Write a protein that binds this DNA or RNA. Structure first.
Lengths: 181, 84, 44, 98, 141
RNA sequence: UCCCCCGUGCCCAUAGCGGCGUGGAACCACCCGUUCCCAUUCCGAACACGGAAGUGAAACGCGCCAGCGCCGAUGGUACUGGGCGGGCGACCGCCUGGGAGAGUAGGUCGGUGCGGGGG
RNA sequence: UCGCCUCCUAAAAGGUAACGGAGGCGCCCAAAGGUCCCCUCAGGCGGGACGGAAAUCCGCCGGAGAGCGCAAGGGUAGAAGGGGGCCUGACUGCGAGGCCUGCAAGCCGAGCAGGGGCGAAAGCCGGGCCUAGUGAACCGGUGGUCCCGUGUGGAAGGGCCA
RNA sequence: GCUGACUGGGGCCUGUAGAGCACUGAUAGGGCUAGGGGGCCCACCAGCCUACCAAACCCUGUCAAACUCCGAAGGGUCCCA
RNA sequence: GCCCGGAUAGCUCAGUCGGUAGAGCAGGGGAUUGAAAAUCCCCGUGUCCUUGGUUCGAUUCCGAGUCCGGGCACCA
């Protein structure tokens, strides 16, 4: 649907809180998610003749978008492969789809991380926006222990209107991000 | 009579000179065809009634008279203002 | 490798250059013959 | 940015520049060299319908008929950042072709 | 001995010595200079020699500022050989010096010690020298 | 003829960076959508279409500021067309025409053409 | 050492010698070509699971120091750079007019015709960002072909185009 | 058959002399300071210091045929005398 | 440029005169021994270089692309 929980939560709960905390004059000054770009590194797939198109069609279930097939820009003998035919797997989420993804991630996925004490509170640093990376991709509901074969982690960058990480920290913590105080 | 022995250099070359440069100047009457500049880049950019060949060579597209032009950051243009 | 080209099924020639190992095989291309205007041309 | 400046590919007389606003669409037949604008037609800025692409045809027709009068038969079609599509001035008229 | 650490080119043309100094012509560091009165190439071995004498004099004492630096290579064909067969081998390095160049400079010393030290050095140099102070050499506002 | 905005050229940084204020009636944007045209190596982000609730926050326009950037005399030198001198040489000097570069004073937070919409 | 290309020497047009300084060439690309449509670099500072000090991802700052097969120089993002779509103009018949120039070579070329390619169109396309990757004639070989064919018809063998 | 050299006025073209350090390198003294050496000193990996080697950055000083942000005098050329 | 000869297991190589894929050696285990060899036993390795085709099938027959091996010429 064109409406989801978090989306509602943002408007009818967080929006105001922030206007009250930091005293914004204009609706637009009030920070808002921009996007959540998620990406997998994949140092293999190159070699062992590995098609490994297993990861995108899989990823597509969790993110809800067919991911995009990213490739190496230099040649590195040291670290293998030569520009081009190379490997990496990246998807960009905005609007509803962005929301549905975070909804599930926060409300479900981070729960069944192996350890967990909260998300690292040093991954904005002024440079608004927040990064974190994961190890197991089966922590999401859609992924099952049957489906897996290799445990491919991922990086999650989440980008915002906030120009300082003060006001960005608030936004995420209030949207339901558990931070490791 | 004891002759000292010597070496060699690995140096003695240059290319054929290639006669680059402007071939007609401001206010020289020219016929269509006349090449106006032999150059190795866009040292001059082609203006009014000025074509440029695969080798960067500028040339009159009409029978006219040549004007030059510096446009600072836009560079230098050679034009042919036509007489008629 | 040096190379010639024939208005497939007769005369004419155009002459080029392929790189055998590099993308090469059966070189075919739509070129023009003065031999009544204009067809597909093969190597040889 | 939108550099685009395919208009920089102006080599041979009579530019029909087009500016498309979210709201409207405007267009002028410009003479370079002289640095001079001759004829000029607009969206509701020429007082016309509350639509869009269907308005574009009309502001086209409109531009042309005006210019025809003044001699102008033929030009070149611009809009710089155009993506030549949609809001198309496929008017009768002009001999700029297409 | 005293040479660059790299050069773009290994050998270079001899050239000439138009008058003047261009710059390096006013004091700037220490409180007494040794100035050039004639153009010359000064060789690293000379610079060094002078410098050492300076110190030796006011042994381990004040401070010294060597204001010319031998960047120019000095070629010389092998001994006994005839002409041609390319340029010669590089033997040393020179500093191009032209009248009014302040080649040395000293600080933290008595005028007596200084006067003298410099004189001494002027001897090791293959050109005529003069001693200087700190006049209207203060290009300020 | 005088404002303000929208296009579009010319001058080529005295037009710039950075700061600071302003402007939404009109323009313009951002915006509301993603049915339709058209789009994405994945994304309506971009491109594109249908819109008009909301904002001038962003971007754009207008003002102020010299910290940075840019420009920059006058004077005096360097160098030198041509004429002539000294030295054994490196090189130096006088005449008469030309005359920098650095630097000092100083200046600059642009100017202007055509066409449109609004007082 | 011997031909060719880049730079300097070369004294601000061109040209300029030496067994002067210092490097490259004798290839390469069926896409590294034509057109249309998109896109913008290297670095630097943050921030991010495997992950180096540059693997891929995000954000600022960054007019060009990236890149343009290869030497150098020139040029160049208002593309010559990168990506995609259809393509074969890496055309055939010609060439006003010029550069260069002892000769012979070398180089640029608008425009017209044929029949095409891309574009809505304006237009652009006679290979490649440019300057090396080359070898006169003679003598032969191929494939064509209005030609010649030693009394005639054909052959043999020549010429013509490639 | 007045078009020549040379001269006067106008207009283009230029990268030397000189100068400069904005690029490419070289470079003196000082400050700050990524790494690395080495003393303090321990494997809990940190941590403090260095009249040592040493990027960038700052201040002050320089050098260059194959450096140039800059640039004369002159030189080449066309027009009209 | 033109005519020959060849390709079969990791290596060197036998052959239906179109119906079987094999030596030898290296290689791995087992018997012998004061030993290392030579011995003696057992077990793995097959696009028979390549697509086509003749024929009831093909590994040997024919067309063929391919790579090495020679051989004889030629070079303005």
């Amino acid at each position: 649907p064109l409406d989801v929980a978090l989306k509602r939560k943002y408007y009818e709960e967080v929006r105001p809180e922030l206007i009250r905390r930091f005293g914004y004059q204009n609706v637009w000054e009030v920070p808002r998610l921009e996007k959540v770009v998620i990406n997998q590194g994949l140092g293999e797939a190159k070699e062992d003749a590995r098609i490994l198109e297993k990861a995108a069609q899989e990823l597509a279930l969790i993110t809800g978008q067919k991911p995009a097939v990213t490739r190496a820009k230099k040649s590195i003998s040291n670290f293998k492969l030569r520009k081009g035919m190379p490997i990496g797997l990246r998807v960009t989420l905005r609007r509803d789809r962005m929301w549905i993804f975070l909804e599930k991630l926060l409300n479900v996925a981070l729960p069944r991380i192996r350890d967990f004490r909260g998300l690292n509170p040093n991954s904005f640093d002024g440079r608004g926006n927040y990064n974190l990376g994961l190890r197991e991709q089966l922590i999401f509901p859609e992924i099952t222990y049957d489906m897996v074969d290799a445990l491919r982690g991922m990086d999650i960058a989440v980008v915002t209107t906030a120009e300082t990480d003060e006001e960005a920290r608030a936004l995420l913590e209030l949207l339901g991000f558990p931070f490791r105080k | 009579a004891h002759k000292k022995g010597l070496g060699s250099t690995r140096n003695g070359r240059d290319s054929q000179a290639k006669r680059l440069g402007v071939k007609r100047y401001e206010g020289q009457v020219v016929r269509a065809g006349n090449i106006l500049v032999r150059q190795r880049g866009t040292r001059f950019k082609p203006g009014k009634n000025v074509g440029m060949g695969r080798d960067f060579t500028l040339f009159a597209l009409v029978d006219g008279v040549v004007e030059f032009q510096d446009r600072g950051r836009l560079g230098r243009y050679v034009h042919v203002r036509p007489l008629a | 490798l040096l190379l010639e080209c024939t208005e497939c099924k007769r005369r004419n020639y155009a002459t080029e250059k392929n790189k055998r190992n590099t993308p090469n095989k059966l070189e075919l291309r739509k070129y023009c013959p003065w031999c009544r205007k204009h067809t597909v041309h093969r190597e040889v | 940015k939108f550099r685009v400046r395919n208009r920089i590919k102006r080599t041979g007389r009579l530019r029909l520049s087009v500016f498309r606003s979210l709201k409207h669409i405007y267009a002028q037949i410009i003479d370079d060299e002289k640095g001079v604008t001759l004829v000029s037609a607009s969206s509701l800025a020429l007082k016309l319908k509350g639509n869009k692409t269907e308005v574009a045809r009309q502001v086209g027709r409109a531009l042309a008929e005006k210019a025809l009068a003044l001699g102008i038969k033929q030009v070149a079609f611009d809009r710089g950042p155009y993506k030549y599509h949609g809001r198309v001035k496929a008017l009768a008229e002009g001999a700029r072709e297409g | 001995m005293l040479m660059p650490r790299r050069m773009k080119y290994r050998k270079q043309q001899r050239g000439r010595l138009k008058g003047a100094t261009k710059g390096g012509d006013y004091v700037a560091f220490g409180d007494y200079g040794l100035v050039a009165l004639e153009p010359a190439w000064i060789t690293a071995q000379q610079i060094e020699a002078a410098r050492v004498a300076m110190v030796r004099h006011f042994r381990r004492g004040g401070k010294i500022f060597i204001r010319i630096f031998p960047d120019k290579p000095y070629t010389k064909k092998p001994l006994e050989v005839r002409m041609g067969k390319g340029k010669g081998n590089v033997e040393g390095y020179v500093a191009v010096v032209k009248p009014g160049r302040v080649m040395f400079e000293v600080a933290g010393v008595t005028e007596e010690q200084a006067m003298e030290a410099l004189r001494i050095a002027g001897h090791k140099l293959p050109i005529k020298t003069k001693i200087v102070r700190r006049d209207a050499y203060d290009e300020a506002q």
